Amino acid sequence: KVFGRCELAAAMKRHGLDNYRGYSLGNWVCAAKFESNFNTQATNRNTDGSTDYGILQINSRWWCNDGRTPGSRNLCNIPCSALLSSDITASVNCAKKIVSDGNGMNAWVAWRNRCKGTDVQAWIRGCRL
Numbered sequence: 001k002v003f004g005r006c007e008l009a010a011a012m013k014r015h016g017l018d019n020y021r022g023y024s025l026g027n028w029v030c031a032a033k034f035e036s037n038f039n040t041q042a043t044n045r046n047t048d049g050s051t052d053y054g055i056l057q058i059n060s061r062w063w064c065n066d067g068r069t070p071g072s073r074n075l076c077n078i079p080c081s082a083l084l085s086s087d088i089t090a091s092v093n094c095a096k097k098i099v100s101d102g103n104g105m106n107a108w109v110a111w112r113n114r115c116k117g118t119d120v121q122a123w124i125r126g127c128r129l
């Protein structure tokens with residue numbers, strides 16, 4: 001599923017991401033835009049053999065099991081394919097564990113490089129929230 005901007009904002013808010021660990025809703029929408037272009041089916045291979053999955057490009061090296069990242073962890077206790085569903089529950093719940101990890105949203109390379117220190121509120125402008 002490819003989400004609309006305000007559609008994803010609303011779903012993320014419903015799932016309790018707005019101000020989760022102090023990160024406003026705009027931060028999450030911005031991250032999702034630049035990680036996956038709002039596409040739940042997005043996948044990208046990393047140099048180390050792991051893969052990033054879903055709207056927030058959650059990585060198999062630590063967070064999920066894709067059956068092909070040998071010697072990795074499954075800290076969210078899920079198959080990586082769960083991160084590709086039209087239902088974003090699994091992605092959101094795993095993201096909450098990631099952002100609590102100690103590095104906050106810096107865990108997302110695209111957020112650090114493209115969202116951090118910018119007017120992230122613009123990502124929810126016009127939405128009926």
Ligand SMILES: O=N[O-]
Nearest residue numbers: 004005006007008
């Ligand atoms: O959800 N369309 O911005």
Ligand SMILES: O=N[O-]
Nearest residue numbers: 011086087088089
């Ligand atoms: O649960 N919203 O995909």
